[PDB]
């Protein structure tokens, strides 16, 4: 059951897996890029803040990190500081299957977007993935800038 607004944030908590990653600047999400991090779980706090626990590669090793995201004034939007100021929202979710987040990173040099699909399981339906691709094309992210992480190291081994 697919939700596209009025998200019930309580239902996005718990464990997720990073499945697709996309950006309008490809380097951001390729190996070594600052945005190539692999979600573990999302914790929702009493003040509506969210804590993303994730893994990133540090000298070849999966290292746990924690991202604090705060609700902005604007509805559905969150901000988080990581390699700049990021504003993000939920595009779509089936709470027990997948979720798609859109993010704008603002920085002195060049704004970029990210799009990410997480699954409750390590993989999701190829239909869902195609739907993520079309959302990306609508946002001027070309399909060549869309990485599927199911057959690469995404720190599953460190979870």
Numbering used by the authors: 6 to 164
Copy text verbatim from the article accompanying this structure deposition.
Can f 6, a recently identified lipocalin allergen produced from the submaxillary gland and detected in dander, shows a high amino acid sequence identity with Fel d 4 (67%) and Equ c 1 (55%), major cat and horse lipocalin allergens, respectively. Lipocalins are characterised by a common tertiary structure exhibiting an eight-stranded, antiparallel β-sheet closed back on itself forming a continuous hydrogen-bonded β-barrel.
Two regions with high RMSD, Leu50–Ser53 and Val111–Gln115, are located on the extruded turn and exposed to the solvent. All other regions are superimposable among the four molecules in the asymmetric unit with low RMSD, indicating that the four molecules have essentially the same structures. The estimated molecular mass was 19.9 kDa, indicating that rCan f 6 is present as a monomer in solution. Consistent with these findings, the X-ray crystal structure characteristics of Can f 6 remarkably resembled those of Equ c 1.
